[PDB]
Symmetry: C3
Subunit: 115 residues, 3 copies
Amino acid sequence: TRQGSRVVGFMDFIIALGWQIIPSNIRYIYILNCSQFMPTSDVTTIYFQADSGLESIFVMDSPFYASCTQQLPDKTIKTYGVTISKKQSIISINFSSSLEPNIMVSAWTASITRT
Amino acid sequence: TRQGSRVVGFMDFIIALGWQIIPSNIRYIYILNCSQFMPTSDVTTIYFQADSGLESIFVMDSPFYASCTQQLPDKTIKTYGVTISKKQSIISINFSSSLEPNIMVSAWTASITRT
Amino acid sequence: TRQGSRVVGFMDFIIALGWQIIPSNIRYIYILNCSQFMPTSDVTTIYFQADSGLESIFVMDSPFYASCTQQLPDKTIKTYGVTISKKQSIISINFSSSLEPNIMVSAWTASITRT
């Protein structure tokens, strides 16, 4: 099993990611997760340069796909699709619509299995 | 702790399940997870015959309940309830509504505690 | 390191929480999770007194924020924000809207990275 982390300063906020590769007879499992974070603007994309560790989970053609939420002051919940892709050393995290500023986003986990 | 995996071919696509039993003198935790997958038709149910490992987590009368999402072409997010039950050796994964073909479904995890 | 579990009787139902601290030189994590549960009334807040172990994950000013769902009888899915905070030894789990009685709530996990 291989694992690592990456804490990213994006604009004026922090997002904290972890990755794992879990090998077995049947499959390799590629895990990407992210702690809760508070964006400071109407972010649609978070991007950064990855090192070799995090790069190593982007083995499939398909991006990772997860979901997350924010709770509005009126208590309605917004759900966002989260698509995480790599081009060269740049990782991009794309949200299905722009996030609300200054509201916490829930932690999320993506998982890809390669047979 | 005990754990395992099962890859399921269903129709013309794959889903990959992991399971864990985490015993303690406080509780047993039964974990079922699934990697992201891409259904190729508007399925409502994925079923298959369980292996010994996977059958071992179905100790309680209640089915496992989790949720997942798909991001539609217009960027709206559909959330699905996922109910996972066993009758004899047959495991059924029931989605609350039919999945959209050819769109990735997010990974999910379910957890039951027995005290 | 540090981890533990707490089974809480709240009114006439049970919720089962797990906590973990993952020290790190890079991404120091505090995790709170909860197994699926079935509330018996239209609860908005679950609260209880914590012991030192569970208290020990509430180091940040920011509450934990997660999400969970219920599959309603028409097979639509309602998503709830889950905000978990500590005041003195009382832990409060606040749902964004009152839960529907007698319907399973999905398991959830919250993750905070310190720094």
